[PDB]
Amino acid sequence: MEVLYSLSKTLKDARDKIVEGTLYSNVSDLIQQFNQMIVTMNGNDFQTGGIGNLPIRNWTFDFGLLGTTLLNLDANYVETARTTIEYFIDFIDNVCMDEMVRESQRNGVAPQSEALRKLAGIKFKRINFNNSSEYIENWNLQNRRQRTGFVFHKPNIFPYSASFTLNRSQPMHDNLMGTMWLNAGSEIQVAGFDYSCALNAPANIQQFEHIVQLRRALTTATITLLPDAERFSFPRVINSADGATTWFFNPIILRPNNVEVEFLLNGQIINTYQARFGTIVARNFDTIRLSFQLMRPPNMTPAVNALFPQAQPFQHHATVGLTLRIESAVCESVLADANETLLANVTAVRQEYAIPVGPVFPPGMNWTELITNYSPSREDNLQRVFTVASIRSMLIK
Amino acid sequence: MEVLYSLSKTLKDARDKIVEGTLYSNVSDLIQQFNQMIVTMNGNDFQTGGIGNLPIRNWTFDFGLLGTTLLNLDANYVETARTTIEYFIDFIDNVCMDEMVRESQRNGVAPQSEALRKLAGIKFKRINFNNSSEYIENWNLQNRRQRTGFVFHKPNIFPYSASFTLNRSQPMHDNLMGTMWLNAGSEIQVAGFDYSCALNAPANIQQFEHIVQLRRALTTATITLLPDAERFSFPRVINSADGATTWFFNPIILRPNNVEVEFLLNGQIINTYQARFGTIVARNFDTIRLSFQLMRPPNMTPAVNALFPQAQPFQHHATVGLTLRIESAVCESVLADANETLLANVTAVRQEYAIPVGPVFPPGMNWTELITNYSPSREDNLQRVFTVASIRSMLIK
Amino acid sequence: MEVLYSLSKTLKDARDKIVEGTLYSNVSDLIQQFNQMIVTMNGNDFQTGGIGNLPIRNWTFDFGLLGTTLLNLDANYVETARTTIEYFIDFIDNVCMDEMVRESQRNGVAPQSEALRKLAGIKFKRINFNNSSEYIENWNLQNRRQRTGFVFHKPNIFPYSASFTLNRSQPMHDNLMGTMWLNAGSEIQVAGFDYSCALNAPANIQQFEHIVQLRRALTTATITLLPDAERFSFPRVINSADGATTWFFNPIILRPNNVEVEFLLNGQIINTYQARFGTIVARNFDTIRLSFQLMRPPNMTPAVNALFPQAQPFQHHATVGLTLRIESAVCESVLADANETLLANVTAVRQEYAIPVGPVFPPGMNWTELITNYSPSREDNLQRVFTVASIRSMLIK
Amino acid sequence: MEVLYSLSKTLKDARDKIVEGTLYSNVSDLIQQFNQMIVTMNGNDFQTGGIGNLPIRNWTFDFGLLGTTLLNLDANYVETARTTIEYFIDFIDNVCMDEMVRESQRNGVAPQSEALRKLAGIKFKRINFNNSSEYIENWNLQNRRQRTGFVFHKPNIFPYSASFTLNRSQPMHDNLMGTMWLNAGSEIQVAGFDYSCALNAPANIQQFEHIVQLRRALTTATITLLPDAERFSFPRVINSADGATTWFFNPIILRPNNVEVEFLLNGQIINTYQARFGTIVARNFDTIRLSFQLMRPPNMTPAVNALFPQAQPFQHHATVGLTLRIESAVCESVLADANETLLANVTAVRQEYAIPVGPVFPPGMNWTELITNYSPSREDNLQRVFTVASIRSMLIK
């Protein structure tokens, strides 16, 4: 795969630097590299595809070395180079598409795609060029065990889940208390609600807690924490736990008092912020613990006093919420983002040719079901297909 | 254009690489490029500006070549290079602004700005250095017909439009049914509202449909789909269709059931997802069809039953929402984003010097109109101006 | 594929110019070219077909050269030449069919069909003869992007669409105003109708509009505008808007007065013709904006009086009409036309072998849904298959 | 003019035949032609435009020649050639546009447009390449006075005229007889009508005749003659000849018995066809005499008997029609067609630049008024501008 990245990089560099009229001093090293690639690939035949509707294609390389007796590139040089480069780009695109669809429960990081295996052979090592991109750098770092790292902007670390726990409930659903929440991508929104506005509670203070167990530890994450979860502050009717009935939820948004957000790694408090909204940092963490409180306001003008009776009906239901966006972070393992397009590329390549459901990845590369269960084999295969997708997206957009 | 980018690239690399103490091994190739630029631009007169408040400037080049005998760069070398580089950088800035401020109804891709037009001649073809940047690489890949592609983070593809349709209504506005929708930037929010909560709909399900046709096909776009449109989940008073009378809206947010989202290209369905929220993908799509349903809850707790009567009043109005954010995408033609600054640079350069409204671009370059009407002429000019803006932003920030 | 066109051109020239008794001077250069072609193609093996019912064929060339020491061609020379030419024409026909059947959503300009993709290599650049045909010259221009144009006799730009709009209506469809139109091929036929014959209208004038939005802008179009649209000028019964009932339409044609035709390009009034009929010209346009008026006759004979009463019955319904035939036009992109058989040739080659439906083209190459949705990928695939079809028709008819 | 056509022809052949990899034998003669053009255009200054909004542009030529000894062309060769060819194409386009907007009552054929008038000198005679196209060949043959001919597909010889004659009438317009005719483009739809159905005519026959006198005689024309003109065969309300009052017209269609079409050339009956429909041929003609007869049916079943009474009211009016399409023709002087964009090009070039209305052509170059009065000066200027536009179309579309 280092070889595949090097072919992609040198093809990009050749399509970039080899232009009409450019100095030969500007591309002498590139021409040396490109000739090394040409001599290494000549006299070799590859076969790509053969899964799903992805068609079989046969490649045979017999090309001519680019010239070196030229002081300043002219049109002949560029035209010959581009006839070669188009073919090489098409070959690389097909190889990347072929490897992105293969899949192995055992030995995931190893290369599938017998064409790409032949590339992984020993006589193609000399095509190696440089490994500067993030994904290939992390690939090499992991192949020689070492601290990897990817920077993600708004990562999809949370599996999608909207739900609610009712700590107090009745069949009538007239007097409830609990927490609703939505985790999605980089967004957390939690809303602890109490229909009685914390009357019977000790000291008129109702505690709410939410635990979010990340599937992979993040690092040096910047987080934006705000009060008043928006999505749980309008009147809804929610199907009950088993769907037997539907209960009405009519929020009135109090202020979450003495909130406390803790970022935990193996249970150790790595960071903690007590009533400090706005941008904050989580040094290193695989769990989040948001603990807030619904305190009944002691003083109350007649309007809010009318809102909160002490009898049974409770026409308006108190709610306090928190919103938490992971604006950016650093993860040791690969994830989808709002910035990268790797998940889209892989899923689209699978969907173009209707690749059958394989052993490890879920149907359709559903990211939610992929990240809920993120076992090591699945992570290995995901890293492999993601780095191949990165190599492809280097040349193909 | 290619030569202008080349000048910008070599000046950037001169400003960066040529610093005191640097080995000549690190700048040999760049010094050769710089000397070639000096020789091939010596004794040529350029004249930039002459539109609006952009001042007319005359540029004459007579600069000495740079040394080669050195082992390590020293303070003399850096000083000569710095003097030359500042002049070239000002010249490049003015050429880029002169090219950005101009338009052309016909033959948009061809260069305006007689300075750049002179640059486009055979005389300066020896300056092409390497077309590495994404914008120039796509410029070449389109200048000879190949599959270009730009990657975007939150591309504002949707022209701003907040509006509604009423499939059932009457002047008293007591019993409405219809949809509201806001498309803005890269987010769609659509809410179907029935005042009668699908009381008399067949099977107590009210069907809602929302079709949005993107002005350009988006390739391998990763999307975030979530329920419960926020912006239409709170009470409002909205104008009538005619603007005569204002009508009250007071939603209660049911869930959207058996929601289907269909990504369509040329009418044909490319992708379709059945009640699958969270992160999803779209291979290609000229358009999006969000279909959903308001199902009256069959088993209703007394609270929600009180909310939904069989009578006429209908004090609370049932609704179901959807929100869809294009987190990233790949399009064949340029657009503004939440990451790039090209539209900002272009509009700012126009507004600084008060360029009169030209043939093709709207007044003030408002993206809403500039994407509502996105004719091929406008697209060609926009690509030209954006590539020039990127060339400028390589150096001037 | 310019090499493919060159092969076709030289084989046609060989079949035409190499005839017995012709002076060697008439065919010396052609013999030189044909020998170049033979030497280039010798020892190269091609594979064609394998999609649908198109059979797999293998081509191997080892053909002797034609002499040059003959002062004046005789029968045997022509016999050997034609023995070679028949084989070459067979190979070219098969390659062209193979390239026409295939199809590509992404990167449609490039060749499919391994035979043609091998012809695109560098060994075969010496076959390039010339590019005289309109389609190949446009191909070369657009590839090395330039302003281009295809001249079409009576284009079928408009997709088939027969319909009507009812501005005034009843459930009984007794008293209707509105428009009827058929856009088909090169011909617009639009007729406004008023059942009351401008009884209550302002100043006994009823205004009728009709916008038609060409998918691609046409240039230097010659148009024939006549009054009295025929097809909507006799009794009919037309289904309702939703198909519930059917309404009777008994037209008596008035005369369309102060007719206007505005030819628009991007909302810009390029041309305007008022009270003009017969041959007109639209130098460049993108939509046709027809407008006409139904004036109640101020003076009336007793017969016309009896036709049009002031009361409710309205036995006879006044109509005004307009026919607009685009005789010839010039377009940037390809379009089926009534002069050349490109679409028919491509469609026939698909049907003769039952090619399964591909990604981009409609099923059966249905021109109506091909032109209604005419995205860039569809357009460039159409250009490729049209060019190959012309190349084939240079030899096979 | 011949020189301008030779410039266009050699540029077109340069753009076609001078392509990558072609043998030198394929383009030797063209290369020497190109060198001749360059040498004889060097050192000469031309000025173009100055009328209307044509910019006053200045052309100066100093270009290098093209190599001779290389045995097979290549990319850089084509690059130099293309750098020259683009400028020459621009110059020719501007010269043609400048010539197409000039007129002269006296000596129209002579060249206006001082650029072309300079090209008409003895210096530029060495450019003359070969006058192959139809328009240039007839230009030469008609200057050196000889017989010429333009082949036309549906020539719009007939000026647009829809009208009628009443051989019987009343102030009521209730019992009429006469003819109506549309002469438009290549179409003659003529319909005789009789409100009495030839009741009191001799032998129950009513004679109708229509004389259509061409402006210029046509040669070897194929004419499609069909019965039952579809255009006048439905209800109408028609203003009177004076415009005072309108009259109803309610056709019932008989076939025209013993129709007789005579094609006349200066009185003599060149051709005559009795009772022959479908395609026919007129070898040489200048006037068309269409005679037909409305014979009342002798035997007449009860429904049609009810239609035709012996009394006065005459609710239905008998008519016999004829349709005549000049499908093809050959004309001595120039005309517009449905197969050539020459009138369209000239009118477009005038309308783009808003040329003030000149002596000879009508305002707007409307073909109806340009053919109604077609005096020899107008014909000469029209032929000049048409051949100039033909020259332009060889390069610009």
Taking the C-alpha atoms of residue C92 and residue D101, their distance in angstroms, rounded to an integer, is: 47
Q: Do C278 and D184 touch (CB under 8 A)?
A: yes
What span, in angstroms and rounded, lies between the C-alpha atoms of D328 and C222? Answer: 18
- Nearby residues of C397 by Cβ (< 8 Å), 6 or more positions away: none
- Residue A120 and residue A109 in contact, taking contact as beta carbons nearer than 8 Å: no
Closest residue in chain B to residue A22, using alpha carbons only: B128
Q: Report the binding-site residues of C for Ca(2+).
A: 266, 286
Q: Which residues contact B170 (CB under 8 A, 6 or more apart)?
A: none
3-state DSSP of chain C: CHHHHHHHHHHHHHHHHCCCCCEHHHHHHHHHHHHHHHHHHCCCEEEECCCCCCCCEEEECCCCCCCCCCCECCHHHHHHHHHHHHHHHHHHHHHHHHHHHCCCCCCCCCCCCHHHHHHCCCCCHHHCCCCCCHHHHHHHHHHCCCCCCEEEECCCCEEEEEEEEEEECCCCCCCCEEEEEEEEECEEEEEEEECCCCCCCHHHEEEEEEEEEEEEEEEEEEEEEEECCCCCCCCEEEECCCCCCEEEECEEECCCEEEEEEEEECCEEEEEEECCCEEEEEEEEEEEEEEEEEECCCCCCHHHHHHCCCCCCCCCEEEEEEEEEEEEEEECCCCCCCCCCHHHHHHHHHHHHCCCCCCCCCHHHCHHHHHHCCCHHHHHHHHHHHHHHHHHHCCCC
Q: Read out DSSP for D271-325?
A: EEEES--EEEEEEEEEEEEEEEEEEPPSS--HHHHHHS-SSS--SSEEEEEEEEE
Cβ partners under 8 Å of residue D154, min gap 6: C327, D185, D186, D325, D326, D327, D328, D337, D338, D339
Q: Which chains touch C (3 or more CB pairs under 8 A)?
A: A, B, D
Considering only alpha carbons, which residue of chain C is nearest residue A353?
C359
| D382 backbone dihedrals φ, ψ, rounded to 5° | -65, -45
Angstrom CA distances, B270 to A51, B205, C371, stand at 21, 27, 19
Nearest-10 Cα torsion for C269, C271, C275, C281: -150
Please report, as a single letter, which amino acid is at residue D262: E
- Considering only CA atoms, which of C395, C388, C396, C376 is closest in space to residue C342? C388
Contacts of A64 in chain C (CB under 8 A): 122
Specify the DSSP element, H or E, that contains A175.
Answer: none
Q: Which residues of C touch B (CB under 8 A)?
A: 105-107, 109-110, 142-145, 147, 266-267, 286, 360, 369, 372-373, 375-378, 380
Q: Do C378 and B332 touch (CB under 8 A)?
A: no
- Distance CA(A101)–CA(A349), nearest Å, equals 7
Query: Residues B267, B268, B273, B279: what is their CA dihedral angle, to the nearest 10 degrees?
Result: -80
Q: Which of B103, B106, B139, B145 to mutate to test the interface with C (most CBs of C within 10 A)?
A: B145
Helical ranges in chain A per DSSP H? 2-17, 28-41, 75-101, 114-120, 134-143, 302-307, 342-353, 367-372, 376-395
Contacts of A47 (CB under 8 A, 6+ apart): A56, A57, A58, A59, A114, A115
CB atoms within 10 A of CB B102: 19
**Cβ–Cβ under 8 Å, residues B157 and A50:** no
From C132, C222, C329, residue closest to D343, measured CB to CB:
C222
Which of C110, C120, C122 is nearest residue A80 as measured by Cβ atoms? C122
B8 half-sphere exposure, CB direction, 13 A CA radius: 26
Chain A: closest CA distance from residue B203 (Å): 18
| Pairing status of strand C45-48 against strand B246-249 | unpaired
- CA neighbor of D318 nearest in space, from D162, D231, D168, D199: D199
Chain B contact residues (CB < 8 Å to C): 107, 109, 142-147, 217, 265-267, 284, 286, 332, 373, 375, 377-378
d(CA A56, CA B163): 50
Q: Which residues pair with C117 in a beta bridge?
A: none
- Nearest residue on chain C to B270, alpha-carbon basis: C359
What is the number of helices (H) and of strands (E) in chain A? 9, 14
Query: Side chain identity at A358, as an amino acid letter?
Result: G
Per the DSSP assignment, residues forming a β-bridge with B325 are B187, B224
Instruction: Show the DSSP H helices in B205-312 as ranges.
Output: 302-307
| Strand-pair category, B205-227 with B236-239 | unpaired
| Cβ(A150)–Cβ(A382) below 8 Å | no
The four Cα atoms D115, D116, D119, D121 give a dihedral, to 10 degrees, of -110
Among A11, A17, A23, A157, pick the best mutation site for testing chain B contact (most B Cβ within 10 A).
A23
Binding residues of B: 153, 266, 286
Q: Dig out the tokens for A341 from the structure.
A: 């397009």
What whole-number distance in Å separates Cα of residue B100 and Cα of residue B392?
Answer: 10
How far is residue A4's CA from residue A128's CA, in Å, rounded to a whole number? 8
Indicate the DSSP class of residue B55. P
Q: Which of C235, C149, C232 lies closest to C184, judged by CA?
A: C232
Residue with tokens 């190893």: A110
Q: Which residue in the set C145, C372, C377 is minimally distant from B145, CB to CB?
A: C145
Nearest Cα neighbor of D288 from D189, D153, D366 is: D189
User: What beta strand segments (E) does B254-316 contain?
Assistant: 257-265, 268-274, 278-295
DSSP codes of every residue in B115-161: HHHHHTSGGGGGG-----SHHHHHHHHHHTT----EEEES---EEEE
Q: Which residue of B has its CA nearest to C147?
A: B107
Cα atoms found within 13 Å of the Cα of residue D257, Cβ hemisphere only:
11
Other beta carbons within 10 angstroms of residue C33's beta carbon come to 25
Chain C residue closest to D347 (CA)?
C281
Between chains, do B220 and A345 touch, taking CB under 8 Å as contact?
yes
CB atoms within 10 A of CB D28: 12
* Residue C344 neighbours by CB under 8 Å, 6+ apart: none
Task: Tell me how far apart the alpha carbons of residues D1 and D140 are, in angstroms, rounded to a whole number.
Answer: 10
DSSP strand pairing (B268-274 vs A257-265): unpaired
Q: Which residues make beta-bridge pairs with A237?
A: A248
Technique behind this structure?
cryo-EM
User: Known binding site for Ca(2+): residues of D?
Assistant: 266, 286
Helix (H, G, I), strand (E, B) or coil at D57: strand
- How close, in Å, is residue A331 to chain C by CA atoms? 34
Residue of chain A with shortest Cα separation from C119: A83
Give the Cα separation of D314 and D170 in Å (integer): 14
**C204: how many CB neighbours lie within 10 A of its CB?**
14
**How do beta strands C317-331 and C251-253 pair?**
parallel
Cα–Cα–Cα angle for C211, C217, C219, rounded to 5 degrees: 115
- Taking one residue from A and the other from C, the number of pairs with CB-CB distance under 8 angstroms is 10
Cα D390 from Cα D396, distance rounded (Å): 10
- The interaxial angle of helices B134-143 and B2-17, nearest 10 deg, is 160
Identify residues of C whose CB sits under 8 angstroms from chain A CBs. Answer: 110, 120-122, 125
- The helix or strand, by DSSP H or E, that contains position B12, with its residue range, turns out to be helix B2-17
Torsions phi, psi for A245 (to 5 deg): -140, -175
- Write out chain A residues lying below 8 Å of D74, CB-based: 75-76
Q: Which residues in A lie closer than 8 A to residue C110 (C-beta atoms)?
A: 86
